[PDB]
Amino acid sequence: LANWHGHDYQARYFWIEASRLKNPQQDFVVEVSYEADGPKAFDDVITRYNPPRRSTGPDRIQADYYQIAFHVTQAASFGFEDLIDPAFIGAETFSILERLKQAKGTEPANSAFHLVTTDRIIDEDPLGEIISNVDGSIRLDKLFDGTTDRSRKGKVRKLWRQHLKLSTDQELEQVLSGFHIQQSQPTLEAMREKVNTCFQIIGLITCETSSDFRFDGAARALRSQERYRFTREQFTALCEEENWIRSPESFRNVALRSFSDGPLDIMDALPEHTLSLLSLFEGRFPSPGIEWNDVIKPQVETFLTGIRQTERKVRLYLNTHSSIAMLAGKCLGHKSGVEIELVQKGRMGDSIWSENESQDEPDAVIETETVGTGSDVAVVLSITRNALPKARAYILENQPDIGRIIHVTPANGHGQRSVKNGSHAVAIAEQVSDVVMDADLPVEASLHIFSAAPNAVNFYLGQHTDFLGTCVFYEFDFQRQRDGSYLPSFKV
């Protein structure tokens, strides 16, 4: 059949959004539309809300509008000059800013407009100063300086104002309200994992082992069928007809995040069940160190203690730093009565973790080694990569009191897929706990945890840190070049 103009990237975006129609915890998502015969004005996908959705802003928002830049396998970059050039959205006629202005006249005041691209903002392009790290919103306080066209912001104002045949910067401000640029959005491959993860959670079938993805077909079929928009009733109707309904066992959705809130992920849990740390730091995340222990740790503990004493089942959406994921695990540990479903979200993509699926994996390889007389111990988990060298360097250089490095590598070596599931993660966790308890640390001593693992494994290991006493958690940071080095984060 005839592809969508946005092709499979656009269909997958559509599927993630359409999923909300069958999600009981987002009952306010009342329609999802696509336009596959485009591009037009910010309507590649539209998601409509009733009641209008929660906003950062002063008005509850009736719909999100998406213009999606044609995915290419080769990464590119773009700047403020690209927003007035049609070539960039790959038409001969109307620029994204022209489509925005167009969309701003036809659509209700309380609308949000999003340019979606896998590309990044060029280094030091003024666009990067006017696009919020939090939510991609245009930063109007930064673009509208009160300066004249001569300023660094002025040049951007002037290119855009004159492109849109507007007379004043005040009118350019009005057209740019509700505009968002979502840069470095997930790859096509990662979008496939985002679809599957969204579909499993709402109790639909996934498509895993195949190299063709059944929903890219179903998308094309829906186009030839001329079915472009779906209510909650219409989407459920569709799921029945296609035989997609697997079932769901209801968890409270909770969200812990410390990176950019892309609109794909921003509504994962209600706001009272969402802790977005980059938000709290107005888009400027502190370096690893005492601010983590003094400000972040209380924010996380207070929030997850709130969850723990009301919720018996938690679907924790996790997109955060390693030591925060590990802190999350401690607050919602073994001993707490919380059944946990983990949704691990990052740039590689989305996966679901639980202790449901079984495993008979070999014990991890555990090598201990002596480096001094001191009573402190390091445990180094090399799960994604080999962490020991860089841990050893940091420890020799900075931790005299450390006497023993316990190193933990999975059976089949470190690598993307080195841990199978939650039950394997939990096994390694117990295995590490036994080892660390068997090592008989005195009480006044500290266990130093160096982890190179994805969020879920750090969470499960965090679940066992009650058993290991005084613990120091570490962040691996690339502030020592391509090399990188470890800094201490949380002391628990």
Ligand SMILES: [Mg+2]
């Ligand atoms: Mg488009």
